[PDB]
Design a protein around this nucleic acid. Structure first.
Lengths: 133, 51, 309, 148, 201
RNA sequence: GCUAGCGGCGAGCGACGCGGGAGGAGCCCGCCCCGAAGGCGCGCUGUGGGGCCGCGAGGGGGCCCGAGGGCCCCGCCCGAGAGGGUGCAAGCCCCGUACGGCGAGUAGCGCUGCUUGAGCGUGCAGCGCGAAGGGAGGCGCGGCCCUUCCAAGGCUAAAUACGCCCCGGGACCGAUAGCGGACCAAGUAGCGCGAGCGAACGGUGAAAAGGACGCCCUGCGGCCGCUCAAAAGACCUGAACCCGGCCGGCCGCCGGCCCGCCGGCCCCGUCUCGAAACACGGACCGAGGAGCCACGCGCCGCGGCGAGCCCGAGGGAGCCCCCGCGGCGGAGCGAGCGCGAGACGCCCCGGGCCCGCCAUGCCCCUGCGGGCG
């Protein structure tokens, strides 16, 4: 259970905090599972979703793999290239079907440099925890 | 305004209550001289309750 | 009478005498009363705002305007009444209410003792709803050394017959049926064993096990001993807890345990005793009623009353 | 327990247990104990004797501690003595070793006599002793000593 | 109930119920108050870790003929009592003894009670000085609660000789007691009669 | 303590002292001694001294569903099965949680007024008059004591109270409720010259995918259909009242029957002696709407314990556990000084006696005292 009083366990307080959260917190909330292959390489269970990430949806209808073309933190959803609603008119511009990032597994990551620096900081912090704190 | 109709039916609902056994035989209003002498007669031989 | 102690392995490690609390007469009424009173004392006060419906300015318009005489605002809107929309409730709730009920110490102790005693009755536990078929003995006394891992505790519980009760709790979690879901009370699970621990640091190991609760012999809780004002909870005593029960229950100033009583079976055996049956005298044979039929009409019927006729 | 209440059962009856010819109205007998010398004299005379008037001398301040005088009967003096000591004392008797009980130390200042002491002699110490108490303890062969 | 036999209520009518100062004092903060006082107490204890939180206070007869038999704890030791041990007031305060110049013993037995209490405390107290002595300070153990808590001893029966005891008590003690009690009234009335006798001839 | 008192002694009003606790801490000036030693443009008309920052476990297959978080089999992590989110009800999908790190115009007194439970004054005040060793001790006055203290100068922590605001919890309310106000714009829109008053208004869907096309129409708009699981299409469900089509009857209720005939039926509520009343209220329907709580009292039932009984406030790395005073009862009665119950008795009830109070008569010590009738 929770032994800390500072964190709220109220449904009302929790939903308001998620529904209206700062963008820094929206990022962590919008994390996604690193693949078995990536996890072995980087030693991090889940990394926050980015706009160059290629991800494989594993539950929702539309279970394919694509790059993340757009991230809309306000809608708490990400848009994956190639997963769209059926464009009624054939000669029409596609509308992306937003997928939640929980429903996805990160096949590839946009390596960047800050991503690499962030991956390392966790690797040493997790090592302190693995050293039984 | 004054009227006593239904008084007798109300009185006889469960009435005609007799006075009580203690009332018939009581030491109230009796001659004080009779009462004093009665206590002395009682206070001797079997009737005496004195220790 | 000594209660068998089974170790984490599950095999009769030692024997311990029965604490005399388990000889206390089983009173369900004393338990229910103190349970009801102590649940009320935990209740947090609720009330409406004193300034609700009084914040507006409304005056009865008055007779003659063809409108009912209830306070109405500038517009002519009904206000300030239990029947008016936006009005104060006729008797507003206040926190001045008595949310707590006092209990005499003796009566509280009598209840706590009769609840621990109820745990010993084999059927009381099954009646309450615990699954106790695989449990070897009641009370369950298990010598478990300090346990800090759920898997170690789970093995103890599996090897002593309580896994089915823990599984009844695990597979009983559902969303609630009311506004309580919204009011931070969304999930309800079935209540399971109570592990009484003395100096055996098994609290960390057993805490996340589903439905199971822990309580130091220093402070047994009657709302725990009888969940739902229904006594009969499987209690997995640590061996220190049983060996300390005669101490805990004597350290109560000069509190003397309520004297043992009788049971319906022990009133039935007493009733069937030869002396009681010998006193019984059979009664007179009863009356024959027989609904009236016309006697005059039939020859056989008339002969019972008028044979010569 | 609101559920198990007379008012809830009487819902559906209109007047709610208060009558039709006379209805519940606000204070129709006046508020408080009022009119006890006028309209309610019947009740006040019948059940309240001595309610109206002044009957005694007045002490502007009452000093409870000095007006406090706790009393013990001659029957409970032996009860104060602990049982283990008391049971032997009664068989042993003895003028030299007669029990001394300072009822003041137990918490009582004056000894009254309501019952009978046991025959074994006892010395009682108290601030005051009723005459019947002095006589009874003197009959049991005891001494009514005073205490400071 | 409605009239009939009811003792009259002596509870005063509520005042300032709608407007005015709050005359209702709720106690839902009571459990929280308990945790607060312990937390303030724990913080204070650490600030003077070797020293007991409570200062030594004196045994004092409880006032009135009602409680004159028992003893309780008073504000401070009298200057005479401290002088009997040999401690000046300021030196005593450093040791931990509270000092009250106002109190007067009122007896010679009261002084003896407290001088003995002061003597015992002096033995129990250990003065940790020597600049810093951390090892001794670590195992110092802070005394918890009231220091030397007063003990009120229960009455114990004693053995006495009826013959010697009957020597002090006059025979007919009640007459002796009732005469002493009424002597003032009897004496005044007989003086009142002497004036009447003087005022007849 | 809850009653000493106060009050057309009426209605009502009403402290403190003990006792148990939390908390505790003592001092300083004037006066007087020095006399500038001082804070030195002053001052000898006296200065100075005596909280943040983190990591963070472990789930697959089958079937189906618009989509599992569903089911059916098997597993794994719990110092984490508190919660929230995610296309349905998720310990293992995401976040988190458990586990971490860094003393004089005075006192007094006279007269008045206000006030207090304070009563021939509880404190204050005006004016008049005014001390010296004084104050008090709860019935005034004048003596005599006895206990206790030193007013007319000043400081002082702690324990206590409490809103905005922030944080957390709730046997709280669920949009006519809950704050007036859940709505990106509420003290807002509006109103009153102004002081002031003061609303209404929550919900599409998982994703706007918020409507492909064609047909026509002078055109509007309609029509198909489309998207979607569904139109859910300006929105969740969509009741009652009320109304339009189409179909079916001739009809208020109650009973018998095949069913439109016979029989019976005044309009409720409400005051009232009496209502169908030419008494009153009621167009209709929906939602809301009225003996609740606190405290005191009387009595009853129960439960614990019993000449006892008692979660008082509080205090115990203590949580519903433990320890924990008054009080109330056990003795009454009398204005009070005071004095002070045993003799019976299943129970009840009378009688008899005992205790106090009001007398009376006797006897005698430690005497208006005691005892006895």
């Amino acid at each position: 259970m929770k032994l800390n009083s500072a964190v709220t366990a109220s449904r009302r307080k929790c939903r308001k905090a998620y529904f209206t959260a700062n963008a820094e917190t929206r990022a962590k909330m919008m994390s996604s599972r690193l693949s078995k292959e990536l996890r072995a390489e980087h030693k991090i269970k889940t990394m926050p979703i980015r706009r160059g990430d290629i991800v494989e949806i594993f539950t929702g209808g539309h279970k394919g793999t694509g790059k993340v073309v757009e991230v809309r933190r306000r809608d708490y959803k990400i848009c994956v290239e190639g997963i769209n609603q059926k464009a009624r008119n054939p000669e029409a511009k596609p509308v992306p079907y937003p997928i939640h990032p929980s429903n996805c597994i990160i096949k590839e990551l946009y390596m960047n440099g800050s991503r690499y620096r962030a991956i390392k900081r966790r690797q040493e912090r997790n090592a302190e925890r693995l050293a039984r704190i | 305004n004054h009227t006593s109709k239904n008084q007798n039916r109300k009185d006889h609902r469960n009435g005609i209550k007799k006075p009580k056994k203690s009332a018939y035989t009581s030491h109230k209003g009796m001659c004080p001289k009779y009462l004093r002498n009665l206590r002395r007669s009682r206070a001797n031989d079997p009737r005496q309750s004195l220790r | 009478p000594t209660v068998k102690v089974f170790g984490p392995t599950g095999t009769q490690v030692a024997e311990l005498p029965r604490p005399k609390v388990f000889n206390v007469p089983l009173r369900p009424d004393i338990i229910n009363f103190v349970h009801t009173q102590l649940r009320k004392c935990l209740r947090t006060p609720y009330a409406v705002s004193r300034y609700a419906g009084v914040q507006c300015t409304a005056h009865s318009w008055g007779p003659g305007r063809a409108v009912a005489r209830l306070p109405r605002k500038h517009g002519g809107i009904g206000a300030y009444a239990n029947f008016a929309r936006g009005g104060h409730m006729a008797h507003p709730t206040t926190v001045i209410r008595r949310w707590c009920r006092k209990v005499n110490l003796n009566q509280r102790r009598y209840a706590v003792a009769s609840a621990l005693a109820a745990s010993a009755n084999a059927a009381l536990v099954e009646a309450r709803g615990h699954r106790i078929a695989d449990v070897p003995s009641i009370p369950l006394v298990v010598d478990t050394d300090n346990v800090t891992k759920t898997k170690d505790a789970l093995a103890i519980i599996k090897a002593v017959g309580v896994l089915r009760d823990v599984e009844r709790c695990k597979d009983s979690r559902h969303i609630r049926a009311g506004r309580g879901k919204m009011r931070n009370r969304r999930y309800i699970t079935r209540k399971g064993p109570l592990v009484i621990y003395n100096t055996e640091d098994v609290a960390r190991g057993f805490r996340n096990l589903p439905g199971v609760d822990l309580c130091h012999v220093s402070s047994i809780r009657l709302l725990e001993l009888a969940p739902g004002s229904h006594p009969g909870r499987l209690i997995l005593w640590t061996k220190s807890a049983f060996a300390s029960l005669d101490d805990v229950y004597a350290a109560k100033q000069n509190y003397t345990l309520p004297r043992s009583c009788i049971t319906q079976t022990d009133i039935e055996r007493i009733l069937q005793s030869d002396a009681v049956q010998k006193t019984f005298v059979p009664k007179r044979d009863p009356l024959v009623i027989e609904r009236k039929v016309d006697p005059f009409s039939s020859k056989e019927a008339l002969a019972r009353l008028d044979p010569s006729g | 327990p609101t559920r198990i209440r007379k008012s809830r059962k009487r819902r559906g009856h209109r007047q709610m247990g208060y009558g039709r010819v006379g209805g519940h109205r606000k204070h129709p007998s006046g508020r408080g104990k009022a009119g006890g010398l006028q309209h309610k004299r019947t009740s006040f005379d019948k059940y309240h004797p001595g309610y109206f008037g002044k009957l005694g001398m007045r002490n502007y301040h009452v000093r409870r501690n000095i007006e406090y005088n706790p009393t013990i009967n001659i029957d409970k003096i032996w009860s104060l003595i602990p049982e283990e000591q008391r049971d032997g004392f009664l068989q042993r008797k003895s003028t030299t070793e007669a029990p001394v009980v300072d009822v003041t130390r137990f918490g009582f200042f004056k000894v009254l006599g309501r019952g009978s002491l046991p025959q074994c002699p006892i010395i009682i110490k108290a601030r005051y002793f009723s005459s019947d108490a002095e006589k009874k303890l003197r009959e049991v062969g005891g001494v009514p000593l005073l205490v400071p | 109930a409605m009239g009939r036999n009811v003792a009259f209520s002596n509870m005063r009518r509520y005042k300032c119920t709608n407007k005015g100062p709050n005359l209702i004092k709720n106690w839902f903060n009571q459990p929280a108050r308990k945790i607060r006082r312990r937390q303030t107490r724990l913080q204070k204890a650490k600030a003077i870790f070797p020293c007991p939180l409570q200062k030594l206070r004196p045994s004092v007869t409880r006032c009135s003929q009602k409680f004159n038999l028992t003893q309780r704890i008073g504000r401070g030791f009298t200057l005479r009592e401290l002088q009997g041990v040999g401690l000046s007031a300021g030196k005593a305060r450093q040791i931990g003894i509270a000092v009250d110049p106002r109190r007067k013993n009122k007896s010679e037995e009261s002084v003896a009670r407290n001088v003995a209490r002061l003597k015992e405390y002096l033995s129990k107290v250990t003065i940790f000085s020597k600049q810093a002595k951390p090892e001794e300070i670590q195992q110092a153990i802070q005394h918890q609660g009231v220091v030397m808590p007063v003990v009120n001893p229960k009455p114990v029966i004693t053995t006495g000789s009826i013959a010697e005891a009957k020597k002090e008590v006059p025979e007919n003690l009640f007459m002796y007691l009732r005469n002493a009690r009424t002597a003032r009234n009897r004496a005044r009335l007989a003086k009142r009669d002497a004036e009447r006798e003087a005022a007849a001839k």
